[PDB]
From a paper:
For promoter-specific transcription, RNAP and general transcription factors (GTFs) are recruited to the promoter DNA to form the pre−initiation complex (PIC). In this study, we determined the X-ray structure of TFEα and the cryo-EM structures of three forms of archaeal RNAP, including the apo-form, RNAP–TFEα binary complex, and RNAP–TFEα–DNA ternary complex. The structures reveal that direct binding of TFEα can shift the clamp conformation from a closed conformation to an open conformation. Our results support the universally conserved mechanisms of transcription initiation in all three domains of life by showing that direct binding of TFEα, a conserved GTF in archaeal-eukaryal RNAP systems, can open the clamp of the stalk-containing RNAPs.
After screening derivatives of TFEα, we found that the 13 kDa fragment Pfu TFEα (TFEαΔZRD, 1–110 amino acid residues) was crystallized. The structure was solved by a single wavelength anomalous dispersion (SAD) at 3.2 Å and the resolution of the structure was improved to 2.6 Å with a native crystal. There were eight molecules in the asymmetric unit of the SAD structure and two molecules in the asymmetric unit of the native structure. The TFEαΔZRD structure consists of the N-terminal eWHD (residues 5–86) and a long α-helix (α5) that connects the eWHD and the ZRD. Superposition of the globular part of the eWHD from the 10 crystallographically independent structures (average root-mean-square deviation in α-carbon positions are 0.369–0.589 Å over residues 8–62) reveal flexibilities in the wing and the α5 linker. The conformation of the wing can change about 24° (~13 Å), and the α5 can be bent at ~21° (~12 Å) for the eWHD. These results show a potential structural adaptability of TFEα during the transcription initiation process.
Residue numbers in the entry: 8 to 109
The structure:
């Protein structure tokens, strides 16, 4: 599960912890992950949005009926996880191709 090697490049130990706990749980809210990990709830959100732009996490949106506002259930995005992996392999090869051109 080379997923952790990427998350680490975005936001270090905290990001690796968030993915591992999300991986352990399957799905989690922003607040649920903050309690599990001890990271400020504000920081988990930047992670998740960072992970979302890195295409390693997606979500489905549920509407909280008490407040009328939405909250997200995060998940690791395995639909694009293999594509993200595949791009990383391709980027490394392209780095090698430039060397053969040295």
């Amino acid at each position: 599960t080379a997923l952790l090697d990427m998350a680490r490049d975005i936001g270090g130990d905290e990001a690796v912890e968030v993915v591992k706990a999300l991986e352990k749980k399957g799905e989690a809210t922003d607040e649920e992950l903050a309690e599990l990990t001890g990271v400020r709830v504000n920081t988990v959100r930047k992670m998740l949005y960072a992970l979302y732009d890195a295409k390693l996490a997606t979500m489905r949106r549920v509407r909280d009926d008490e407040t009328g506002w939405y909250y997200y259930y995060w998940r690791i995005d395995t639909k694009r996880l293999p594509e993200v992996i595949r791009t990383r392999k391709l980027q490394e090869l392209e780095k090698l191709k430039q060397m053969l051109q040295e």
